[PDB]
């Protein structure tokens, strides 16, 4: 009955569920905007937001924990140097969810989950 439980199952096993966000967060960190399923977007906030707040204060310990997650060097390089110190003033809620029609193949709600930035 899942009273007060949290964490969408997303029709996948424990491994795949964890593994897809690791790959999905990488896409969000690298391109600053993606287009995914609406429920998948809402769950991505629970994973990215920590990884950004984790990247506030650059250190030796943090660059390993941000590597323990996301398992990549370009993500840790983009963070802590460009993305990380950029959110100095803002406290939480770095991302933004915006609904966009439906997927034209299975009728699934789409969403552009982007960061409050992109002023290049």
Partner 1 sequence: AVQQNKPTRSKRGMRRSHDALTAVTSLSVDKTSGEKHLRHHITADGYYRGRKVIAK
Residues in touch with RNA (CB under 7 A) = 1-15, 17-19, 37, 39-40, 42, 45-46, 49-50, 53, 56, 60-61, 64-65, 67-68, 71, 73, 90-99, 103, 105-109, 116
Min dist. Cβ of residue 96 to partner 1 (A): 8
Q: Which does residue 100 bind out of RNA, partner 1, none, counting CB within 5 to 8 angstroms by kind?
A: partner 1
Of 39, 38, 69, the residue nearest 52 (C-alpha)? 69
How far apart are the C-alpha atoms of 62 and 10, rounded to whole Å?
A: 29
Residues 6+ apart with CB under 8 A from 97: 41, 42, 45, 111, 113
Residues that bind partner 1 (CB under 8 A): 98-101, 112, 114, 118
């Amino acid at each position: 009955m899942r009273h007060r439980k949290s964490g969408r199952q997303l029709n996948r096993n424990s491994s795949h569920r964890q593994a897809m966000f690791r790959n999905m967060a990488g896409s969000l960190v690298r391109h600053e905007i993606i287009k995914t399923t609406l429920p998948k977007a809402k769950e991505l906030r629970r994973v990215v937001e920590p990884l950004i707040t984790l990247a506030k204060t650059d250190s030796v310990a943090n660059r390993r924990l941000a590597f323990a997650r996301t398992r990549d060097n370009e993500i840790v390089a983009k963070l802590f140097n460009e993305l990380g110190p950029r959110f100095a003033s803002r406290a939480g809620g770095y991302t933004r969810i915006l609904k966009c029609g439906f997927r034209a193949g299975d009728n699934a709600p789409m969403a552009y989950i982007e960061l409050v930035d992109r002023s290049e």
